[PDB]
Amino acid sequence: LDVKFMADTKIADSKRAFELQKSAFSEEVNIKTAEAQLAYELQGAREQQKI
Amino acid sequence: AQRDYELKKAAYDIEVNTRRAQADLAYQLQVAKTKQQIEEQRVQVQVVERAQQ
């Protein structure tokens, strides 16, 4: 069991690095996703002006 | 041996939960910023419309 708990800690430290980086990357994806969705209105409203 | 593992787990879980909370709410913040730019132009049409009236 002593070796077991130590093994579980190293698995957790590996988990930690991964989930942390997922979050960092998801922020970037989420940010540019919103822009991609709403750009049609940013341009659409701007074009209604001339129309 | 269990305690030694339990404390690191909780310690790492603080950061994982913290970073997850940030990532989770990161979408709506940009949606607000984007709408901020859009609404300016939506009502800008009113100004141009009134000017021709």
Residue numbers in the entry:
A (entry chain A): 202 to 252
B (entry chain B): 212 to 264
The study reports:
In this study, we demonstrate that Flotillin1 and Flotillin2 coassemble to form a large, truncated cone-shaped cage whose wide end is always attached to a membrane surface and whose narrow end is sometimes attached to a separate membrane. The entire wall of the cage is without holes and is likely impervious even to small molecules, forming a diffusion barrier that can connect membrane systems. The Flotillin cage is thus well suited to isolate biochemical processes. Through membrane attachment, it also alters local membrane curvature, which could influence endocytic and mechanosensory processes.
We conclude that the cage consists predominantly of 22 each of Flotillin1 and Flotillin2 in an alternating pattern. With a final density map for the overall Flotillin complex at 3.5 Å resolution, atomic models could be built for much of the molecule. The final model consists of Flotillin-1:1-422 and Flotillin-2:1-402. The wide end has a diameter of 32 nm, the narrow end 19 nm, and height 22 nm. The wide end contains SPFH1 and SPFH2 domains at the N terminus. The wall is a single-layered α-helical barrel, and the narrow end consists of the two α-helical layers described above, one with 22 and the other with 44 α-helices. A β-strand from each Flotillin makes a 44-stranded β-barrel inside the helical layer. The narrow end is made by the C terminus of Flotillin arranged in two layers of helices that run in opposite directions and are linked by a β-strand. Adherence to the membrane is mediated by the SPFH1 domains, which penetrate one leaflet of the lipid bilayer. The Flotillin cage, by contrast, uses a hydrophobic surface that contains covalent lipid molecules.
